[PDB]
Amino acid sequence: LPPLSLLDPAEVKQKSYSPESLEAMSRLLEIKLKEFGVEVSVDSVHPGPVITRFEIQPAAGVKVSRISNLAKDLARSLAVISVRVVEVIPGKTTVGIEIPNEDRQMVRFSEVLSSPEYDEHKSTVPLALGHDIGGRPIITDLAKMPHLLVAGTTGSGKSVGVNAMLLSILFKSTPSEARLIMIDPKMLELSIYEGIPHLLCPVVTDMKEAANALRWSVAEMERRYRLMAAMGVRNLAGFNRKVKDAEEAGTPLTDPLPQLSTLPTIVVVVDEFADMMMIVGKKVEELIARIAQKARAAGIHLILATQRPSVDVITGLIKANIPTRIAFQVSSKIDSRTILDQGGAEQLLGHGDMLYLPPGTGLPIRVHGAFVSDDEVHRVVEAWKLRGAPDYIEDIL
Amino acid sequence: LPPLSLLDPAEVKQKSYSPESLEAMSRLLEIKLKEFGVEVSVDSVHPGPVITRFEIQPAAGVKVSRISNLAKDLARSLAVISVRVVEVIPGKTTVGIEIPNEDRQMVRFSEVLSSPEYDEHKSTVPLALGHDIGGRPIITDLAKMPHLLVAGTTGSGKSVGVNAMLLSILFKSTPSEARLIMIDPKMLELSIYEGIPHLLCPVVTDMKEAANALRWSVAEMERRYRLMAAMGVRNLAGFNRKVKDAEEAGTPLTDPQLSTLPTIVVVVDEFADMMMIVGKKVEELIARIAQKARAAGIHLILATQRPSVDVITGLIKANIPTRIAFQVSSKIDSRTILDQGGAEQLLGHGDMLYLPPGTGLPIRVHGAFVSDDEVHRVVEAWKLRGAPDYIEDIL
DNA sequence: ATATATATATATA
DNA sequence: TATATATATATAT
Ligand SMILES: Nc1ncnc2c1ncn2[C@@H]1O[C@H](COP(=O)(O)OP(=O)(O)O)[C@@H](O)[C@H]1O
Ligand SMILES: Nc1ncnc2c1ncn2[C@@H]1O[C@H](COP(=O)(O)OP(=O)(O)O)[C@@H](O)[C@H]1O
């Protein structure tokens, strides 16, 4: 485990303007919406790093569709790039309008990881994603999702988000706990992660090797289910508690079908399963559906990623089994419905601005993706290559 | 029989939402509906565990569709998360507005079994599903359904639902009048039930052995139909009345001494894996069961995770008219199982849509939570009473 | 000005 | 490929 200070340090923040500017922008929003058909007063002003949520209290009779279907013209008349209308704030009566600022400060990855949520976290595969709309950091947990879609068009930060997730893995767990599998169909982005002991294979490029890696993941899932069936334990955390107590009790356990040890948590990232499905066919779709159907209790987790938010790629079989979605900036409302079963993803800004959809029944929480760069990535990868030796399992292909 | 005191005790409920706190909400609802186009008057209030139905009488000359289009904004302006406008309360002249409570309240299973409906129930296979939208216990016999599909996404309260159904079997029925075939294609979930005398086998692992057990079940159904045709018997309950004509009333019979033919409830945890791995001959077996087996003595609790045409075709659709649907992720899946819409609107954690046989109208049922410790207690209470009476040649 | 009807657009059996 | 549903648009209110 390298220390957290090997990242780029925190710069000087400059936002959160004088309250006369916030009151002037509140009165400007009231005047512009009054010049349109609606009439609404600004309730409260919440500043933020990138955007500034204006909670406004709609008057009698005015609907929310009459606020959502003129956001284009409101963003034009407020001289900003694009505005976003929150249809529902949880537990209030108002309607959130989020306006970008003049200067747009980035999200610093050390400022994300310097949080007590990440620092005193319980699990072994956390995923620090970035701040909320006001600077409060979001740190999710991949063993609670248990799978993850990522989409959004180019120039929006998909590979930067995947690198933020993978450094969130690599700053906490040893290779005895979180052992990765990386399937990069290009040679472009995820090729930098070579050498670290957290891998199982060299970073898989060709699609026959991708299908072989998914079939080996199916085999690992089946042998872990058979082993936990023999030992009667429902989940992997209880299994590791059992085997740790058995090894510390002086009588370690045995082969159900030698000596067993603590199993790691396999995280299988995929960078473009659009192109993977394109080259191979429906067999990859059936394998991803099988893994997303069964592999929660066996520790196999997925980080999917795709450029195209279309029905050819994110099919219904993938949507029904993976309930946690990340939505970056997409092209239009049809792409937003394909990724989140609802609108609201097209109104973003890009360059690290996502809509985290939490697992289960939920409302999308706007998260700003942490900007992790090639300096930090290369430095932490060389740190792990100097702190450990590579270990590849040969028969995965 | 095991005692009902094995379950966890009914904790004194956090009966929140005082009558002034709901009277103020009703006055606020009629004011915030009068601010929009409609005019309304609140008729009565039914406070409940999870969702609270506000029965409202609309004004003269206003339509339900105005309330339906106005629904999301009404849910926005009342400081709640969602709403659902029931277009028709059966038998009344009102419109049901169901506002979900912000306190998702757990339903303990002893709070469902202790109803007088369940204790005075006579059939061998009751299913304690949970409470209704109003909070009253809903007990539904399995013998009148006659089969039951279960579908819903991962983390919706499905294994807890199958555990509640099987404990509803086990808290009333002896090993004489009920006997379970547990087809568990996942190796992980329902191995906890191993040891009870209510099994015909150790709990089945492989789809090959599961298909062998289903062939055995087809053959047992066929010999039961042939013996009922020999005895001139019009259903299973008529043959248990012939059992009452037998040594139950102290007059023995012959073997054309016929004992009880136990009602078989075949649970399948994931038949999606089976019907995608081994093919469609299993679907031929399931269709030949599900078309005929009501008057036979073999029933199926089918559970899955793919409400799709790849799993649930039209073959296993028209023959199972009683379906449990948990939280699915699309209206397309809702039309795939319930043949209507409204299944993705569920609030998760066992809150299902019991679709009764006959009337094709959904009946929403909150799922009863049963923990794994209560399961170990019931497994212990059955292992301390009876050795496993197997027909071991099923595999 | 705006709820309704309708022609067509995309997703699925 | 035929169709069920969904979305944008005259239209008359
Ligand atoms: N938090 C952020 N702040 C600023 N820029 C960001 C942030 N996150 C991502 N980016 C931008 O996203 C770009 C990477 O996009 P990428 O994921 O490679 O798109 P694709 O993989 O679809 O081609 C980088 O050039 C970077 O400038
Ligand atoms: N009646 C209930 N009340 C509250 N939570 C419930 C209830 N029934 C089930 N659950 C929740 O559902 C979870 C189990 O889901 P499960 O049936 O295992 O889904 P799956 O089988 O798809 O994994 C449990 O963690 C439990 O908390």
PDB file of C-alpha atoms in Angstrom, chain B residues 120-285:
ATOM      1  CA  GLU B 120     -58.881 -22.001  10.810  1.00  0.00           C
ATOM      2  CA  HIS B 121     -57.594 -22.931   7.341  1.00  0.00           C
ATOM      3  CA  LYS B 122     -58.173 -26.513   6.283  1.00  0.00           C
ATOM      4  CA  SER B 123     -56.219 -27.170   3.072  1.00  0.00           C
ATOM      5  CA  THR B 124     -52.759 -28.693   3.188  1.00  0.00           C
ATOM      6  CA  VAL B 125     -50.946 -25.989   1.211  1.00  0.00           C
ATOM      7  CA  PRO B 126     -51.658 -22.429   2.428  1.00  0.00           C
ATOM      8  CA  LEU B 127     -49.291 -19.637   1.458  1.00  0.00           C
ATOM      9  CA  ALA B 128     -48.833 -16.852   3.992  1.00  0.00           C
ATOM     10  CA  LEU B 129     -47.740 -14.064   1.668  1.00  0.00           C
ATOM     11  CA  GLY B 130     -48.115 -11.079   3.976  1.00  0.00           C
ATOM     12  CA  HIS B 131     -50.404  -8.137   4.515  1.00  0.00           C
ATOM     13  CA  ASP B 132     -52.497  -6.293   1.956  1.00  0.00           C
ATOM     14  CA  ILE B 133     -52.429  -2.569   1.203  1.00  0.00           C
ATOM     15  CA  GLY B 134     -54.613  -1.993   4.276  1.00  0.00           C
ATOM     16  CA  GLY B 135     -52.582  -4.143   6.662  1.00  0.00           C
ATOM     17  CA  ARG B 136     -54.860  -7.195   6.986  1.00  0.00           C
ATOM     18  CA  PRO B 137     -53.275 -10.647   6.531  1.00  0.00           C
ATOM     19  CA  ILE B 138     -53.703 -12.273   3.121  1.00  0.00           C
ATOM     20  CA  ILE B 139     -53.675 -16.078   3.192  1.00  0.00           C
ATOM     21  CA  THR B 140     -54.042 -17.708  -0.225  1.00  0.00           C
ATOM     22  CA  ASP B 141     -54.375 -21.441  -0.791  1.00  0.00           C
ATOM     23  CA  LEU B 142     -52.053 -22.955  -3.365  1.00  0.00           C
ATOM     24  CA  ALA B 143     -54.593 -25.622  -4.366  1.00  0.00           C
ATOM     25  CA  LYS B 144     -56.863 -22.978  -5.931  1.00  0.00           C
ATOM     26  CA  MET B 145     -54.186 -21.118  -7.914  1.00  0.00           C
ATOM     27  CA  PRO B 146     -53.111 -24.015  -8.980  1.00  0.00           C
ATOM     28  CA  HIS B 147     -49.580 -23.063 -10.052  1.00  0.00           C
ATOM     29  CA  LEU B 148     -47.397 -20.098  -9.227  1.00  0.00           C
ATOM     30  CA  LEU B 149     -44.730 -18.236 -11.187  1.00  0.00           C
ATOM     31  CA  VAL B 150     -42.267 -16.016  -9.317  1.00  0.00           C
ATOM     32  CA  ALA B 151     -40.159 -13.411 -11.101  1.00  0.00           C
ATOM     33  CA  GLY B 152     -38.278 -10.282 -10.119  1.00  0.00           C
ATOM     34  CA  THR B 153     -34.818  -8.754 -10.236  1.00  0.00           C
ATOM     35  CA  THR B 154     -31.844  -9.385  -7.974  1.00  0.00           C
ATOM     36  CA  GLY B 155     -32.400  -7.970  -4.508  1.00  0.00           C
ATOM     37  CA  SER B 156     -36.195  -7.769  -4.624  1.00  0.00           C
ATOM     38  CA  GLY B 157     -37.001 -10.237  -1.852  1.00  0.00           C
ATOM     39  CA  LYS B 158     -37.395 -13.468  -3.798  1.00  0.00           C
ATOM     40  CA  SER B 159     -35.528 -16.104  -1.786  1.00  0.00           C
ATOM     41  CA  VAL B 160     -37.231 -14.674   1.306  1.00  0.00           C
ATOM     42  CA  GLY B 161     -40.513 -15.108  -0.560  1.00  0.00           C
ATOM     43  CA  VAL B 162     -39.798 -18.751  -1.385  1.00  0.00           C
ATOM     44  CA  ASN B 163     -38.709 -19.306   2.237  1.00  0.00           C
ATOM     45  CA  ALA B 164     -41.972 -17.765   3.466  1.00  0.00           C
ATOM     46  CA  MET B 165     -43.959 -19.996   1.112  1.00  0.00           C
ATOM     47  CA  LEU B 166     -42.142 -23.143   2.219  1.00  0.00           C
ATOM     48  CA  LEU B 167     -42.503 -22.247   5.899  1.00  0.00           C
ATOM     49  CA  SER B 168     -46.195 -21.622   5.232  1.00  0.00           C
ATOM     50  CA  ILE B 169     -46.179 -25.207   4.012  1.00  0.00           C
ATOM     51  CA  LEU B 170     -44.196 -26.418   7.019  1.00  0.00           C
ATOM     52  CA  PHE B 171     -46.071 -24.673   9.839  1.00  0.00           C
ATOM     53  CA  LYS B 172     -49.293 -26.502   9.044  1.00  0.00           C
ATOM     54  CA  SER B 173     -48.636 -29.657   7.046  1.00  0.00           C
ATOM     55  CA  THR B 174     -47.300 -33.010   8.200  1.00  0.00           C
ATOM     56  CA  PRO B 175     -44.940 -35.091   6.033  1.00  0.00           C
ATOM     57  CA  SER B 176     -48.014 -37.231   5.266  1.00  0.00           C
ATOM     58  CA  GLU B 177     -50.127 -34.643   3.431  1.00  0.00           C
ATOM     59  CA  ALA B 178     -47.321 -32.553   1.896  1.00  0.00           C
ATOM     60  CA  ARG B 179     -43.971 -33.497   0.395  1.00  0.00           C
ATOM     61  CA  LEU B 180     -41.571 -31.169  -1.380  1.00  0.00           C
ATOM     62  CA  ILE B 181     -39.336 -31.581  -4.410  1.00  0.00           C
ATOM     63  CA  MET B 182     -36.648 -28.923  -4.076  1.00  0.00           C
ATOM     64  CA  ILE B 183     -34.945 -28.266  -7.400  1.00  0.00           C
ATOM     65  CA  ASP B 184     -32.147 -25.835  -6.522  1.00  0.00           C
ATOM     66  CA  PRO B 185     -30.014 -25.142  -9.619  1.00  0.00           C
ATOM     67  CA  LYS B 186     -28.048 -22.537  -7.726  1.00  0.00           C
ATOM     68  CA  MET B 187     -25.936 -24.567  -5.327  1.00  0.00           C
ATOM     69  CA  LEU B 188     -26.178 -21.930  -2.612  1.00  0.00           C
ATOM     70  CA  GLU B 189     -29.643 -20.874  -1.468  1.00  0.00           C
ATOM     71  CA  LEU B 190     -31.983 -23.736  -0.554  1.00  0.00           C
ATOM     72  CA  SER B 191     -29.464 -26.285   0.723  1.00  0.00           C
ATOM     73  CA  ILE B 192     -30.421 -25.085   4.218  1.00  0.00           C
ATOM     74  CA  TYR B 193     -33.616 -27.182   4.029  1.00  0.00           C
ATOM     75  CA  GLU B 194     -31.680 -30.452   3.834  1.00  0.00           C
ATOM     76  CA  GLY B 195     -32.592 -32.828   6.654  1.00  0.00           C
ATOM     77  CA  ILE B 196     -36.364 -32.301   6.894  1.00  0.00           C
ATOM     78  CA  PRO B 197     -38.636 -35.318   6.260  1.00  0.00           C
ATOM     79  CA  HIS B 198     -40.536 -33.275   3.636  1.00  0.00           C
ATOM     80  CA  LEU B 199     -38.118 -34.213   0.843  1.00  0.00           C
ATOM     81  CA  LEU B 200     -38.156 -36.976  -1.754  1.00  0.00           C
ATOM     82  CA  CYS B 201     -34.377 -36.724  -2.228  1.00  0.00           C
ATOM     83  CA  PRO B 202     -31.354 -34.682  -1.234  1.00  0.00           C
ATOM     84  CA  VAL B 203     -31.863 -31.244  -2.746  1.00  0.00           C
ATOM     85  CA  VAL B 204     -31.154 -31.436  -6.454  1.00  0.00           C
ATOM     86  CA  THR B 205     -27.990 -29.784  -7.801  1.00  0.00           C
ATOM     87  CA  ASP B 206     -27.591 -30.516 -11.517  1.00  0.00           C
ATOM     88  CA  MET B 207     -30.040 -29.786 -14.318  1.00  0.00           C
ATOM     89  CA  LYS B 208     -29.554 -33.362 -15.552  1.00  0.00           C
ATOM     90  CA  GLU B 209     -30.721 -34.735 -12.202  1.00  0.00           C
ATOM     91  CA  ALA B 210     -33.446 -32.076 -12.111  1.00  0.00           C
ATOM     92  CA  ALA B 211     -34.734 -33.209 -15.509  1.00  0.00           C
ATOM     93  CA  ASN B 212     -34.626 -36.791 -14.207  1.00  0.00           C
ATOM     94  CA  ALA B 213     -36.688 -35.745 -11.169  1.00  0.00           C
ATOM     95  CA  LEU B 214     -39.167 -33.939 -13.421  1.00  0.00           C
ATOM     96  CA  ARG B 215     -39.504 -37.097 -15.544  1.00  0.00           C
ATOM     97  CA  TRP B 216     -40.204 -38.955 -12.288  1.00  0.00           C
ATOM     98  CA  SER B 217     -42.799 -36.296 -11.452  1.00  0.00           C
ATOM     99  CA  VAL B 218     -44.482 -36.721 -14.848  1.00  0.00           C
ATOM    100  CA  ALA B 219     -44.584 -40.499 -14.325  1.00  0.00           C
ATOM    101  CA  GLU B 220     -46.019 -40.071 -10.820  1.00  0.00           C
ATOM    102  CA  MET B 221     -48.681 -37.687 -12.152  1.00  0.00           C
ATOM    103  CA  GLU B 222     -49.552 -40.210 -14.864  1.00  0.00           C
ATOM    104  CA  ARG B 223     -49.879 -43.134 -12.462  1.00  0.00           C
ATOM    105  CA  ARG B 224     -51.982 -40.940 -10.157  1.00  0.00           C
ATOM    106  CA  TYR B 225     -54.326 -40.084 -13.043  1.00  0.00           C
ATOM    107  CA  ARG B 226     -54.528 -43.765 -13.981  1.00  0.00           C
ATOM    108  CA  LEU B 227     -55.301 -44.821 -10.411  1.00  0.00           C
ATOM    109  CA  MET B 228     -57.926 -42.078 -10.099  1.00  0.00           C
ATOM    110  CA  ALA B 229     -59.486 -43.262 -13.361  1.00  0.00           C
ATOM    111  CA  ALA B 230     -59.511 -46.763 -11.875  1.00  0.00           C
ATOM    112  CA  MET B 231     -61.091 -45.494  -8.646  1.00  0.00           C
ATOM    113  CA  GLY B 232     -63.523 -43.082 -10.345  1.00  0.00           C
ATOM    114  CA  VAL B 233     -62.282 -39.972  -8.561  1.00  0.00           C
ATOM    115  CA  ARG B 234     -62.778 -36.422  -9.815  1.00  0.00           C
ATOM    116  CA  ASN B 235     -59.764 -34.632  -8.216  1.00  0.00           C
ATOM    117  CA  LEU B 236     -57.072 -35.057  -5.568  1.00  0.00           C
ATOM    118  CA  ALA B 237     -59.369 -33.958  -2.727  1.00  0.00           C
ATOM    119  CA  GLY B 238     -61.829 -36.647  -3.766  1.00  0.00           C
ATOM    120  CA  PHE B 239     -59.029 -39.162  -3.393  1.00  0.00           C
ATOM    121  CA  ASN B 240     -58.209 -37.832   0.055  1.00  0.00           C
ATOM    122  CA  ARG B 241     -61.918 -38.277   0.758  1.00  0.00           C
ATOM    123  CA  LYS B 242     -61.353 -41.877  -0.345  1.00  0.00           C
ATOM    124  CA  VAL B 243     -58.470 -41.892   2.156  1.00  0.00           C
ATOM    125  CA  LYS B 244     -61.032 -40.730   4.731  1.00  0.00           C
ATOM    126  CA  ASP B 245     -63.178 -43.654   3.529  1.00  0.00           C
ATOM    127  CA  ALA B 246     -60.081 -45.804   4.206  1.00  0.00           C
ATOM    128  CA  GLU B 247     -58.410 -46.496   7.602  1.00  0.00           C
ATOM    129  CA  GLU B 248     -59.009 -42.877   8.721  1.00  0.00           C
ATOM    130  CA  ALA B 249     -62.590 -43.990   9.443  1.00  0.00           C
ATOM    131  CA  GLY B 250     -61.447 -47.508  10.342  1.00  0.00           C
ATOM    132  CA  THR B 251     -62.287 -49.463   7.184  1.00  0.00           C
ATOM    133  CA  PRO B 252     -59.220 -50.621   5.229  1.00  0.00           C
ATOM    134  CA  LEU B 253     -59.013 -50.813   1.446  1.00  0.00           C
ATOM    135  CA  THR B 254     -57.015 -52.701  -1.190  1.00  0.00           C
ATOM    136  CA  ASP B 255     -54.296 -51.836  -3.722  1.00  0.00           C
ATOM    137  CA  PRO B 256     -55.984 -51.913  -7.157  1.00  0.00           C
ATOM    138  CA  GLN B 257     -54.222 -50.651   1.433  1.00  0.00           C
ATOM    139  CA  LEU B 258     -53.755 -47.394  -0.474  1.00  0.00           C
ATOM    140  CA  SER B 259     -52.126 -44.789   1.763  1.00  0.00           C
ATOM    141  CA  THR B 260     -52.301 -41.013   1.362  1.00  0.00           C
ATOM    142  CA  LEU B 261     -51.032 -39.621  -1.925  1.00  0.00           C
ATOM    143  CA  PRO B 262     -49.216 -36.491  -0.702  1.00  0.00           C
ATOM    144  CA  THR B 263     -49.616 -33.137  -2.393  1.00  0.00           C
ATOM    145  CA  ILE B 264     -46.309 -32.353  -4.097  1.00  0.00           C
ATOM    146  CA  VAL B 265     -45.174 -28.735  -4.266  1.00  0.00           C
ATOM    147  CA  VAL B 266     -42.132 -28.686  -6.549  1.00  0.00           C
ATOM    148  CA  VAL B 267     -40.107 -25.556  -5.932  1.00  0.00           C
ATOM    149  CA  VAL B 268     -37.606 -24.453  -8.567  1.00  0.00           C
ATOM    150  CA  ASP B 269     -35.285 -21.622  -7.593  1.00  0.00           C
ATOM    151  CA  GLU B 270     -34.068 -20.685 -11.086  1.00  0.00           C
ATOM    152  CA  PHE B 271     -35.603 -22.389 -14.100  1.00  0.00           C
ATOM    153  CA  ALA B 272     -34.020 -19.776 -16.375  1.00  0.00           C
ATOM    154  CA  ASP B 273     -30.660 -21.558 -16.011  1.00  0.00           C
ATOM    155  CA  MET B 274     -32.301 -24.930 -16.660  1.00  0.00           C
ATOM    156  CA  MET B 275     -34.245 -23.843 -19.728  1.00  0.00           C
ATOM    157  CA  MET B 276     -31.278 -22.014 -21.224  1.00  0.00           C
ATOM    158  CA  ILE B 277     -28.747 -24.800 -20.603  1.00  0.00           C
ATOM    159  CA  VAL B 278     -30.556 -28.049 -21.338  1.00  0.00           C
ATOM    160  CA  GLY B 279     -33.148 -26.892 -23.875  1.00  0.00           C
ATOM    161  CA  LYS B 280     -36.883 -27.073 -24.549  1.00  0.00           C
ATOM    162  CA  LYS B 281     -37.687 -30.704 -23.690  1.00  0.00           C
ATOM    163  CA  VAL B 282     -37.772 -29.539 -20.067  1.00  0.00           C
ATOM    164  CA  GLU B 283     -40.300 -26.942 -21.232  1.00  0.00           C
ATOM    165  CA  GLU B 284     -42.290 -29.795 -22.801  1.00  0.00           C
ATOM    166  CA  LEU B 285     -42.296 -31.535 -19.396  1.00  0.00           C
TER     167      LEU B 285
END
